[PDB]
Structure formats: structure tokens, C-alpha cells
Coordinates of C-alpha atoms in Angstrom, one line a residue:
Chain A
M1 CA 22.1 18.7 29.7
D2 CA 19.9 15.7 28.8
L3 CA 21.9 12.5 28.0
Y4 CA 21.1 10.1 25.2
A5 CA 22.9 7.1 23.8
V6 CA 23.1 4.5 21.2
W7 CA 23.5 1.0 22.8
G8 CA 25.0 -1.9 20.9
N9 CA 27.7 -4.5 20.4
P10 CA 29.8 -3.6 18.8
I11 CA 29.3 0.2 18.7
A12 CA 32.5 2.2 17.7
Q13 CA 31.1 1.6 14.2
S14 CA 28.0 3.8 14.9
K15 CA 27.2 7.1 13.1
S16 CA 24.3 7.9 15.4
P17 CA 26.3 10.1 17.8
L18 CA 27.6 12.0 14.8
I19 CA 24.1 12.4 13.4
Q20 CA 22.3 13.1 16.7
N21 CA 24.7 15.7 18.0
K22 CA 24.5 17.6 14.7
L23 CA 20.7 17.5 14.9
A24 CA 21.0 18.9 18.4
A25 CA 23.4 21.6 17.5
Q26 CA 21.1 22.5 14.6
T27 CA 18.1 23.1 16.8
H28 CA 19.8 24.6 19.9
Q29 CA 19.0 21.6 22.1
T30 CA 20.9 21.3 25.4
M31 CA 21.6 17.6 25.0
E32 CA 24.4 15.2 24.2
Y33 CA 24.4 11.7 22.6
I34 CA 27.0 9.1 23.3
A35 CA 27.9 5.5 22.3
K36 CA 27.4 2.8 24.8
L37 CA 28.7 -0.7 24.5
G38 CA 26.3 -3.2 25.9
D39 CA 27.6 -6.3 27.6
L40 CA 26.2 -9.4 25.9
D41 CA 24.9 -10.7 29.2
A42 CA 24.6 -7.6 31.4
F43 CA 23.0 -5.1 28.9
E44 CA 19.5 -5.0 30.4
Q45 CA 20.8 -4.1 33.8
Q46 CA 23.3 -1.7 32.4
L47 CA 20.5 -0.1 30.4
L48 CA 18.3 0.3 33.5
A49 CA 21.2 1.7 35.4
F50 CA 21.8 4.2 32.6
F51 CA 18.2 5.4 33.0
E52 CA 18.3 5.6 36.8
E53 CA 21.4 7.7 36.3
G54 CA 19.2 10.2 34.5
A55 CA 19.4 9.6 30.8
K56 CA 16.3 10.6 28.8
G57 CA 16.4 8.0 26.0
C58 CA 18.5 5.9 23.7
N59 CA 18.8 4.2 20.4
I60 CA 19.3 0.4 20.3
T61 CA 21.2 -1.6 17.7
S62 CA 22.4 -5.2 17.3
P63 CA 22.0 -7.3 19.1
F64 CA 19.6 -6.0 21.8
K65 CA 16.7 -4.6 19.8
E66 CA 14.4 -7.4 20.9
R67 CA 15.6 -7.4 24.5
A68 CA 15.2 -3.6 25.0
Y69 CA 11.7 -3.8 23.6
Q70 CA 10.9 -6.3 26.4
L71 CA 11.9 -3.6 28.9
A72 CA 9.3 -1.1 27.6
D73 CA 6.3 -0.2 29.7
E74 CA 4.6 1.4 26.7
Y75 CA 5.2 0.8 23.1
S76 CA 4.2 1.8 19.5
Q77 CA 2.3 -0.2 17.0
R78 CA 5.6 -0.1 15.0
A79 CA 7.6 -1.6 17.9
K80 CA 4.9 -4.2 18.4
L81 CA 4.8 -5.5 14.9
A82 CA 8.6 -5.7 14.7
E83 CA 8.8 -7.3 18.2
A84 CA 11.9 -5.0 18.5
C85 CA 12.6 -1.4 19.0
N86 CA 15.5 0.9 18.1
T87 CA 14.3 3.8 20.3
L88 CA 13.5 4.2 23.9
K89 CA 12.2 7.2 25.7
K90 CA 12.1 7.7 29.5
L91 CA 8.9 9.5 30.4
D92 CA 8.5 11.9 33.3
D93 CA 6.9 9.3 35.6
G94 CA 9.7 6.9 34.9
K95 CA 8.0 4.7 32.3
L96 CA 9.9 3.6 29.3
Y97 CA 8.2 4.2 25.9
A98 CA 9.4 2.1 23.0
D99 CA 9.2 2.8 19.3
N100 CA 10.7 1.4 16.1
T101 CA 12.0 4.1 13.8
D102 CA 13.4 2.1 10.9
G103 CA 10.3 1.9 8.7
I104 CA 9.3 5.5 9.0
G105 CA 12.9 6.5 8.2
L106 CA 12.7 4.4 5.1
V107 CA 9.3 5.9 4.0
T108 CA 10.7 9.4 4.5
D109 CA 13.7 8.7 2.4
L110 CA 11.6 7.1 -0.3
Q111 CA 9.2 10.0 -0.3
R112 CA 12.2 12.4 -0.7
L113 CA 13.1 10.4 -3.8
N114 CA 9.4 10.3 -4.9
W115 CA 9.6 6.5 -4.9
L116 CA 6.7 5.9 -2.6
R117 CA 3.6 6.4 -4.8
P118 CA 0.6 4.7 -3.3
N119 CA -0.3 1.3 -4.8
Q120 CA 3.2 0.5 -6.1
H121 CA 4.5 -3.1 -6.3
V122 CA 7.7 -3.4 -4.2
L123 CA 10.0 -6.4 -4.4
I124 CA 12.0 -6.7 -1.1
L125 CA 15.1 -8.9 -1.2
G126 CA 15.8 -10.5 2.1
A127 CA 13.7 -11.0 5.3
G128 CA 14.4 -10.4 9.0
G129 CA 17.6 -8.3 8.9
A130 CA 16.2 -4.8 8.6
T131 CA 13.0 -5.8 6.8
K132 CA 10.6 -6.8 9.6
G133 CA 11.2 -3.4 11.2
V134 CA 10.3 -1.8 7.9
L135 CA 7.2 -3.8 6.6
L136 CA 4.5 -2.1 8.6
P137 CA 5.1 1.5 7.5
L138 CA 5.6 0.4 3.9
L139 CA 2.4 -1.4 4.2
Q140 CA 0.7 1.6 5.7
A141 CA 2.0 3.7 2.8
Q142 CA -0.1 1.4 0.6
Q143 CA 2.8 -0.5 -0.9
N144 CA 2.0 -3.9 -2.4
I145 CA 4.9 -6.1 -1.2
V146 CA 6.6 -9.2 -2.5
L147 CA 8.9 -10.6 0.1
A148 CA 11.7 -12.8 -1.2
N149 CA 14.2 -14.8 0.9
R150 CA 16.6 -17.7 0.2
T151 CA 15.0 -19.7 3.0
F152 CA 11.2 -19.7 2.6
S153 CA 10.3 -20.4 6.2
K154 CA 11.5 -16.9 7.2
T155 CA 9.5 -14.9 4.6
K156 CA 6.3 -17.0 5.2
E157 CA 6.2 -16.3 9.0
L158 CA 6.9 -12.7 8.3
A159 CA 4.1 -12.5 5.8
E160 CA 1.6 -14.1 8.2
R161 CA 2.2 -11.4 10.8
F162 CA 1.8 -8.4 8.5
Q163 CA -1.1 -9.8 6.4
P164 CA -3.8 -7.8 8.3
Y165 CA -2.2 -4.5 7.2
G166 CA -2.0 -4.9 3.5
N167 CA -1.2 -6.9 0.4
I168 CA 2.0 -8.8 1.3
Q169 CA 3.3 -12.2 0.1
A170 CA 6.2 -14.5 0.7
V171 CA 8.1 -16.1 -2.1
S172 CA 11.3 -18.1 -2.5
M173 CA 14.2 -16.0 -4.0
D174 CA 14.3 -18.5 -6.9
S175 CA 10.6 -18.3 -7.3
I176 CA 10.1 -14.5 -7.7
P177 CA 6.9 -13.6 -9.5
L178 CA 7.7 -12.4 -13.0
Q179 CA 5.8 -9.1 -12.7
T180 CA 6.7 -5.5 -13.0
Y181 CA 8.1 -3.9 -9.9
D182 CA 8.0 -0.1 -9.2
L183 CA 10.6 -0.6 -6.5
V184 CA 13.2 -3.2 -5.6
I185 CA 14.5 -2.8 -2.1
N186 CA 17.7 -4.7 -1.1
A187 CA 17.7 -5.7 2.6
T188 CA 20.4 -8.4 2.4
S189 CA 23.8 -8.1 3.8
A190 CA 27.5 -8.3 3.3
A197 CA 21.9 -10.2 -3.1
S198 CA 21.1 -13.8 -4.2
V199 CA 19.1 -13.0 -7.3
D200 CA 19.2 -13.5 -11.1
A201 CA 19.5 -10.3 -13.2
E202 CA 16.4 -10.5 -15.4
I203 CA 14.5 -10.3 -12.2
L204 CA 16.1 -7.0 -11.4
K205 CA 15.3 -6.0 -14.9
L206 CA 11.6 -6.2 -13.9
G207 CA 12.2 -3.1 -11.6
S208 CA 11.9 0.6 -12.2
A209 CA 13.8 1.6 -9.1
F210 CA 16.4 0.2 -6.8
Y211 CA 17.0 1.1 -3.1
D212 CA 19.7 -0.5 -1.0
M213 CA 19.2 -0.4 2.7
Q214 CA 22.9 -0.5 2.8
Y215 CA 25.3 2.3 2.1
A216 CA 29.1 2.4 1.7
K217 CA 31.5 5.3 2.4
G218 CA 32.2 6.9 -1.0
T219 CA 32.0 3.8 -3.2
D220 CA 28.9 2.0 -4.4
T221 CA 27.4 -1.0 -2.5
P222 CA 27.7 -4.4 -4.2
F223 CA 23.9 -4.3 -4.9
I224 CA 24.1 -0.9 -6.5
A225 CA 27.1 -2.0 -8.4
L226 CA 25.2 -4.9 -9.8
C227 CA 22.2 -2.7 -10.8
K228 CA 24.5 -0.3 -12.6
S229 CA 26.4 -3.1 -14.5
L230 CA 22.9 -4.3 -15.6
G231 CA 22.3 -0.8 -17.0
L232 CA 19.8 -0.1 -14.2
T233 CA 20.7 3.4 -13.2
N234 CA 17.8 4.7 -11.2
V235 CA 19.4 3.8 -7.9
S236 CA 20.0 4.9 -4.3
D237 CA 21.7 3.7 -1.2
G238 CA 20.3 3.8 2.3
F239 CA 22.2 6.7 3.8
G240 CA 19.1 8.8 3.7
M241 CA 17.2 6.1 5.5
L242 CA 19.8 6.3 8.3
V243 CA 19.6 10.0 8.8
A244 CA 15.8 9.9 8.6
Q245 CA 15.5 7.2 11.4
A246 CA 17.7 9.3 13.5
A247 CA 15.5 12.4 12.9
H248 CA 12.4 10.5 13.9
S249 CA 13.9 9.3 17.2
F250 CA 15.1 12.8 17.7
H251 CA 11.6 14.2 17.2
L252 CA 10.1 11.6 19.6
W253 CA 12.6 12.6 22.3
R254 CA 12.6 16.4 21.7
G255 CA 9.3 17.4 20.2
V256 CA 11.1 19.1 17.3
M257 CA 11.5 17.8 13.8
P258 CA 15.0 18.9 12.7
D259 CA 15.3 19.7 9.1
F260 CA 16.0 16.3 7.6
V261 CA 17.8 17.3 4.3
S262 CA 20.6 19.6 5.5
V263 CA 22.5 17.2 7.7
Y264 CA 21.9 14.5 5.2
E265 CA 23.6 16.7 2.7
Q266 CA 26.5 18.0 4.8
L267 CA 27.1 14.4 5.6
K268 CA 26.6 13.2 2.1
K269 CA 29.2 15.8 1.0
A270 CA 31.7 14.9 3.8
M271 CA 31.9 11.3 2.8
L272 CA 32.6 12.0 -0.9
Chain B
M1 CA -31.6 -0.2 -51.0
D2 CA -28.0 -0.3 -49.8
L3 CA -27.1 -3.9 -48.9
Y4 CA -25.1 -5.0 -45.9
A5 CA -24.4 -8.4 -44.4
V6 CA -22.7 -10.4 -41.8
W7 CA -20.3 -13.0 -43.2
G8 CA -19.6 -16.1 -41.1
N9 CA -19.7 -19.9 -40.9
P10 CA -21.7 -20.8 -39.1
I11 CA -23.9 -17.7 -39.3
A12 CA -27.4 -18.7 -38.5
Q13 CA -26.9 -17.9 -34.8
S14 CA -25.9 -14.2 -35.6
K15 CA -28.0 -11.5 -34.0
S16 CA -26.4 -8.9 -36.3
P17 CA -29.2 -8.8 -38.8
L18 CA -31.7 -8.3 -36.0
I19 CA -29.7 -5.5 -34.4
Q20 CA -28.7 -3.7 -37.6
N21 CA -32.2 -3.6 -39.1
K22 CA -33.4 -2.1 -35.8
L23 CA -30.6 0.5 -36.0
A24 CA -31.6 1.3 -39.6
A25 CA -35.2 1.7 -38.7
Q26 CA -34.6 4.1 -35.8
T27 CA -32.4 6.3 -38.0
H28 CA -34.6 6.1 -41.1
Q29 CA -31.9 4.5 -43.3
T30 CA -32.9 2.9 -46.6
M31 CA -30.8 -0.2 -46.1
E32 CA -31.1 -3.9 -45.5
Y33 CA -28.9 -6.3 -43.7
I34 CA -28.7 -10.1 -44.3
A35 CA -26.7 -13.0 -43.0
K36 CA -24.5 -14.7 -45.6
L37 CA -22.9 -18.1 -45.1
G38 CA -19.4 -18.1 -46.4
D39 CA -17.9 -21.2 -48.0
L40 CA -14.8 -22.4 -46.0
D41 CA -12.7 -22.2 -49.1
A42 CA -14.4 -19.8 -51.5
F43 CA -15.2 -17.1 -49.0
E44 CA -12.9 -14.5 -50.4
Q45 CA -14.0 -14.8 -53.9
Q46 CA -17.6 -14.7 -52.6
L47 CA -16.9 -11.5 -50.7
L48 CA -15.4 -9.8 -53.7
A49 CA -18.3 -10.7 -56.0
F50 CA -20.7 -9.5 -53.3
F51 CA -19.0 -6.1 -53.2
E52 CA -18.9 -6.3 -57.0
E53 CA -22.7 -6.5 -57.2
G54 CA -23.1 -3.4 -55.0
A55 CA -23.0 -4.3 -51.3
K56 CA -21.8 -1.2 -49.4
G57 CA -20.3 -3.1 -46.4
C58 CA -20.6 -6.0 -44.0
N59 CA -19.6 -7.6 -40.7
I60 CA -17.3 -10.6 -40.3
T61 CA -17.1 -13.4 -37.8
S62 CA -15.3 -16.7 -37.4
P63 CA -13.7 -18.0 -39.2
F64 CA -13.2 -15.1 -41.6
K65 CA -11.9 -12.1 -39.6
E66 CA -8.2 -12.5 -40.4
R67 CA -8.9 -13.4 -44.0
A68 CA -11.3 -10.4 -44.5
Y69 CA -8.6 -8.1 -43.1
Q70 CA -6.0 -9.2 -45.6
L71 CA -8.4 -8.3 -48.4
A72 CA -8.7 -4.6 -47.4
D73 CA -7.0 -1.7 -49.3
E74 CA -7.4 0.5 -46.4
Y75 CA -7.6 -0.1 -42.7
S76 CA -7.7 1.5 -39.2
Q77 CA -5.3 1.2 -36.3
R78 CA -7.8 -1.1 -34.5
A79 CA -7.7 -3.5 -37.5
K80 CA -4.0 -3.5 -37.8
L81 CA -3.4 -4.3 -34.1
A82 CA -5.7 -7.3 -33.9
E83 CA -4.5 -8.4 -37.3
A84 CA -8.2 -8.9 -38.1
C85 CA -11.3 -7.0 -38.6
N86 CA -15.0 -7.4 -37.9
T87 CA -16.1 -4.6 -40.3
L88 CA -15.6 -3.8 -43.9
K89 CA -16.8 -0.7 -45.8
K90 CA -16.8 0.0 -49.5
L91 CA -15.6 3.5 -50.0
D92 CA -16.8 5.7 -52.9
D93 CA -13.6 5.3 -54.9
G94 CA -13.8 1.5 -54.7
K95 CA -11.4 0.8 -51.9
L96 CA -12.2 -1.7 -49.1
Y97 CA -11.8 -0.3 -45.6
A98 CA -11.4 -2.5 -42.6
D99 CA -12.0 -1.7 -39.0
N100 CA -12.5 -3.6 -35.8
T101 CA -15.2 -2.3 -33.6
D102 CA -15.3 -4.8 -30.8
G103 CA -13.0 -3.0 -28.3
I104 CA -14.9 0.3 -28.9
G105 CA -18.1 -1.6 -28.3
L106 CA -16.5 -2.7 -25.1
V107 CA -15.4 0.8 -24.0
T108 CA -18.8 2.2 -24.9
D109 CA -20.6 -0.4 -22.8
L110 CA -18.2 0.3 -19.9
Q111 CA -19.0 4.0 -20.2
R112 CA -22.7 3.2 -19.9
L113 CA -21.9 1.2 -16.8
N114 CA -19.6 4.0 -15.5
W115 CA -16.9 1.3 -15.0
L116 CA -14.4 3.2 -17.2
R117 CA -12.3 5.6 -15.1
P118 CA -9.0 6.9 -16.4
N119 CA -5.9 5.2 -14.9
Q120 CA -8.0 2.3 -13.7
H121 CA -6.4 -1.1 -13.0
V122 CA -8.0 -3.8 -15.2
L123 CA -7.4 -7.5 -14.9
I124 CA -8.3 -9.5 -18.0
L125 CA -8.7 -13.3 -17.7
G126 CA -8.2 -15.6 -20.6
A127 CA -7.2 -13.0 -23.1
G128 CA -6.1 -14.6 -26.4
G129 CA -6.4 -14.5 -30.2
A130 CA -10.2 -14.1 -30.2
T131 CA -10.2 -11.1 -27.9
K132 CA -7.1 -9.0 -28.6
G133 CA -9.5 -6.7 -30.3
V134 CA -10.3 -5.0 -27.0
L135 CA -6.8 -4.2 -26.0
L136 CA -6.0 -1.0 -28.0
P137 CA -9.3 0.8 -27.2
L138 CA -8.8 -0.1 -23.5
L139 CA -5.2 1.2 -23.6
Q140 CA -6.4 4.4 -25.4
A141 CA -8.8 4.9 -22.6
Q142 CA -5.8 5.1 -20.3
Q143 CA -6.6 1.7 -18.7
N144 CA -3.8 -0.1 -16.9
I145 CA -3.9 -3.7 -18.0
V146 CA -2.8 -7.0 -16.6
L147 CA -3.3 -10.1 -18.8
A148 CA -3.6 -13.4 -17.1
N149 CA -4.1 -16.7 -19.0
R150 CA -2.9 -20.3 -18.5
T151 CA -0.2 -19.2 -21.0
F152 CA 2.2 -16.2 -20.3
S153 CA 3.7 -17.4 -23.6
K154 CA 1.1 -16.4 -26.2
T155 CA -0.2 -13.6 -23.9
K156 CA 3.4 -12.3 -23.4
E157 CA 3.5 -11.9 -27.2
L158 CA 0.3 -9.8 -26.8
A159 CA 1.9 -7.6 -24.2
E160 CA 4.9 -7.0 -26.4
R161 CA 2.8 -5.9 -29.3
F162 CA 0.6 -3.5 -27.3
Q163 CA 3.5 -2.0 -25.3
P164 CA 3.8 1.2 -27.3
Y165 CA 0.2 2.1 -26.6
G166 CA 0.0 1.9 -22.8
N167 CA 0.7 0.0 -19.6
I168 CA 0.1 -3.6 -20.1
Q169 CA 1.9 -6.7 -18.9
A170 CA 1.3 -10.4 -19.2
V171 CA 1.5 -12.8 -16.2
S172 CA 1.0 -16.3 -15.2
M173 CA -2.4 -17.1 -13.6
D174 CA -0.5 -17.5 -10.3
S175 CA 1.6 -14.3 -10.7
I176 CA -1.2 -11.8 -10.6
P177 CA 0.1 -8.6 -8.9
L178 CA -1.6 -8.4 -5.5
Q179 CA -3.9 -5.4 -5.5
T180 CA -7.3 -4.1 -5.9
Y181 CA -8.5 -4.2 -9.6
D182 CA -11.2 -1.8 -10.5
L183 CA -12.3 -4.0 -13.3
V184 CA -11.9 -7.7 -13.9
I185 CA -12.8 -8.9 -17.4
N186 CA -13.5 -12.4 -18.3
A187 CA -12.3 -12.9 -21.9
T188 CA -12.4 -16.7 -21.8
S189 CA -14.7 -18.2 -24.4
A190 CA -16.5 -21.4 -23.8
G191 CA -14.6 -24.0 -25.9
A197 CA -14.0 -23.3 -15.9
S198 CA -13.4 -21.5 -12.6
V199 CA -10.9 -19.0 -11.2
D200 CA -9.3 -18.9 -7.8
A201 CA -11.8 -17.1 -5.6
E202 CA -8.8 -15.3 -4.1
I203 CA -8.3 -13.7 -7.5
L204 CA -11.9 -12.6 -7.9
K205 CA -12.1 -11.0 -4.5
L206 CA -9.5 -8.4 -5.7
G207 CA -12.0 -6.8 -8.0
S208 CA -14.6 -4.1 -7.5
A209 CA -16.5 -4.8 -10.8
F210 CA -16.8 -7.8 -13.0
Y211 CA -17.6 -7.9 -16.7
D212 CA -18.2 -11.1 -18.7
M213 CA -17.6 -10.6 -22.4
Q214 CA -20.1 -13.4 -22.9
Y215 CA -23.8 -13.2 -22.1
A216 CA -26.6 -15.8 -21.9
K217 CA -30.3 -15.9 -22.7
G218 CA -32.4 -15.1 -19.7
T219 CA -30.0 -16.3 -16.9
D220 CA -26.5 -15.6 -15.7
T221 CA -23.3 -16.9 -17.3
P222 CA -21.1 -19.3 -15.3
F223 CA -18.6 -16.5 -14.6
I224 CA -21.3 -14.2 -13.3
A225 CA -22.9 -16.9 -11.3
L226 CA -19.6 -17.7 -9.6
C227 CA -19.2 -14.0 -8.8
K228 CA -22.6 -13.7 -7.3
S229 CA -22.1 -16.9 -5.3
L230 CA -18.8 -15.4 -4.0
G231 CA -20.7 -12.3 -2.8
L232 CA -19.4 -10.2 -5.7
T233 CA -22.5 -8.3 -6.7
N234 CA -21.2 -5.6 -9.1
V235 CA -21.5 -7.6 -12.3
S236 CA -22.3 -7.3 -16.0
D237 CA -22.6 -9.6 -19.0
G238 CA -21.5 -8.4 -22.5
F239 CA -24.8 -8.0 -24.2
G240 CA -24.2 -4.2 -24.2
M241 CA -20.8 -4.8 -25.9
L242 CA -22.6 -6.7 -28.6
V243 CA -25.1 -3.9 -29.4
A244 CA -22.5 -1.2 -29.0
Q245 CA -20.1 -2.8 -31.5
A246 CA -22.9 -3.1 -34.0
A247 CA -23.8 0.6 -33.5
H248 CA -20.1 1.5 -34.2
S249 CA -20.1 -0.5 -37.4
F250 CA -23.3 1.2 -38.3
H251 CA -21.8 4.7 -37.6
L252 CA -18.9 3.9 -39.9
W253 CA -21.2 2.8 -42.7
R254 CA -23.9 5.5 -42.3
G255 CA -22.3 8.5 -40.7
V256 CA -24.8 8.7 -37.9
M257 CA -24.2 7.3 -34.4
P258 CA -27.5 5.5 -33.5
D259 CA -28.8 5.4 -30.0
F260 CA -27.0 2.5 -28.4
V261 CA -28.2 3.2 -24.9
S262 CA -31.9 3.0 -25.9
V263 CA -31.7 0.2 -28.4
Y264 CA -29.9 -1.7 -25.6
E265 CA -32.4 -0.9 -22.9
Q266 CA -35.3 -1.4 -25.3
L267 CA -33.7 -4.8 -26.2
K268 CA -33.3 -5.8 -22.5
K269 CA -36.9 -5.0 -21.6
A270 CA -38.3 -7.3 -24.3
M271 CA -35.4 -9.8 -24.3
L272 CA -35.9 -13.2 -22.6

């Protein structure tokens, strides 16, 4: 039985094991996926011990995404641009291959929703957080991106990095260009925008999801009469499927688990 | 001899008489076309007399477009949207019919250039009161339009009005959505330069103005920037006159060949 794990701090909160084991059961894979708490100082050496032990790969969450990427021997264009990775794969020789599966999970979910038509204008609220891991694949799907953040320095540096891949610009959250947006993506944790701005959007995607209830962002949209909305639960299951495909060579059907899970929560 | 004219002030610079008489000759129409200088105050009463003595129709330029439109009995969708007209026709009954051919002159020319694909993204610079006549025909040709001006006040009013007819929005000169534009139109009349970063977003460039022999400043800027796919608006001028002709006469003259003929021997 091949072992896999999600590494983080904290970790009890994770849904990856839940997702990944279901994906495995669904495709008759002889594997298991567990949750591993990484020590803030000792992670890297725990991680390497975990691989010597015989693990085949793992997901990485806060706060070691950047550190785990630094352990990779080989890495994807996605991981490179994000300077972080959420997925590691141990190759047969013993090399570690790193990829960042966030963005492609997002594009998949948006494609499911038919919210990723080429040449759209997307307003993204919030930088860093989950957005830098997501910009490259959005850009490659020909999305024209406006990146807004409360602190300008953050968006600007992010825009400079991704500029060679498409039309992307940095703006201050209070200085958002008064143009039509096909899609507004909320990255921010735990908003910061005036409502008319949101009334420039045709669609609203929160990279957050809440169990049962709506997220604060989605609640805001709905109270503004903006109904064409979605949370990011689909993005979460999609990322997981992509890491799974990289590890196993089999794309599990993305929808079904998303649904059973959708159903279970509500 | 059916009489037609162009009414303006000033009017001595109009090429209408030259274009129309050529159009009439090529289609064998027994008609004449003269330039008439309208008095800044008595225009209206002059136009009515003029029709009263038998004129069958005319063209209108500054500053009478809006005033001519308000005299009509009958009018087209193009006239109503620009709240002005460049073409009047006296119907058999006695009704005055107003139309505005400039936008259709524009689409016709763009067809000749093959710069008019359905669902294209078109950036229009300096769109205002003088050129709102091109908006409807562009929208009706399924063009996606962005209006940029130093306003986004007056132009946002434009966007609102043309919203029921297609995709059009107004933006600040610095809030131009970042994307490839298949067509960039200079609507600014000379009465300056654009960020080169704006211009590099376009694949084709059309100046609604034209100049005798040389290039216009907008076109010269484009060439200097390396942007080689360019056109002035001479074709629009001839095309819109052909459309006025067609309304008055019932035969669509040969725009493409009066145009090329007129470029060969131009200046």
C-alpha cells in the first residue's frame, strides 16, 4: 500500500484525507492518505524522513508550501512561478518532483461552471494568499486579470512576475478600474471593497467555502442582488484530483465526489 | 433636373458636390447637386423654402445636423439615436425623411478593408457628440465597443443610450480594459497623442479623418510606433455619400470603384 499525506500546521482541519481516500476507493487504488502535522522548525527533516520511510508523495499546506518547494529536485512551471508547491511526488530514482495544483484546480472548477471563456476580464480581490498560486493557469487560460489589494506593494510585485504570461495589472483596492468584469474572484480571508464595484461583475467566485452556510463574500453579493455566485469547494476537490492524477496516472471522475461531498455538508 | 444640395456653414470646403455629381454620372441620373450656405439664424426657413421650390433632398453638416433632424416628419433609427441627421429626403406625399448615413459609411468602408468581423473588439478614442452617429451601425454589426475619452462623463451618457443595441461601455482614458483590440478607431476631431501602450493593443487602426496627400497625425504616430495596419477615413466619406445617394435614388452606386478611382487621381 502506497502512503501519501497532507503536511501542515495545523492539520486536523484538513479535508484532503477525506477527499483523497474517496478518490482512491473510487478507482480501486491500493493506497492510503493521512494527515501529518509538521513541526514549525523540524518539518523539512520530518518530511525527508517520511519519504525515506517509503511514502510516494504528499500535499503541503500552511505554512510549509515555500519550504517544501525548496526541497524539490524537479519542479513544474506552476510551482516555479508560485515559488511554492502544494504537491510533491517521489520518483522511482528518489528524486522529488514538485507541482502546484491550486490554479489548475481553479480553472477546472471555473470550466465546470462555464465561467472561463477565453479573453474574459477577471477582477481578483486580494493578493498572495491563494492568488499567486492561481495566476499562472488563469493567465494561460487567456484571462485578462486585474489584481486588487489593500496594500499596493503586494499586487505590484505579483504583477511584475506574471507579466510575461498575459495581460495582468496591479491596482489598489480603492482604485479599482471602473470597467465591466466577467468574473470577480475573492481570494481574501476571514473583502475590503465598495459595492458598486461588485456591481460591475457578471459572476462571483469565492476561493473560500463554508460548511452549509454562505461565506461572507457570497452573502455580500447576494444582499447586493448579485445571485450568479459560487464558493470554492469545487476548486478544493479539483486540486485534490490533479495531485491524485500526478501521483497515480489516473484522473478520477471529478464531479461525483464533489457531489457526494456537496450533498453530505448540506 | 432633380435638385439636391449640401447645407452647411461654412460649406465651401465640402466635397459632397464633387462626389455626388460623379455618383450621378456613373448611374445616369438626371440630377444636380449644389452646395448651399445656410444663414446661422434663418437656416430652417431657408431649408423649407428650398424644398418648397422642388428640391428632392440634401445633405447637412455643421452646424445644422441637429436642427435639420428636428424639422423632419419621418426619420430612421440611425437619425433618432444620434439625435441628428446628415441626410434629408423629400417623399412623394410631402413628408421630410431624415436619416444619418455616417455610421453606415463607416461600416461599408470597414467591409472594404475586411476589418469588420462579427464579435470583434473595437476601441474608440475621443468619441463624442460629433461622432455618435457611428455607434448604432457598429453595434448592429455585432461589434463589441469600448469608448475612451478624457470624459467618462459625457461618454458614459453615450454608453447608457446605446446599451439596448449591443455591448458597449465607457471608460476613462486610463481604465481601458487590457486586451487585444481588433480595431482602434480615432474619433477625435482636430479642434494630440495617445499613450503608445494603448495603441500597441490594436491589430488595425482607422482614423475617421483623412488628409490631402500625406498621413494624418494619428496615422503618422501609428506608423512611427511600428503599427503598419492603418487606414484614414476617405473611404468613409465616399461611402456615406453613396448611402445618401441610394436613399434618394434607389440605386446603390459603386462605392468601391468611385473610391479607388478617386484615390488614383487624388493628390
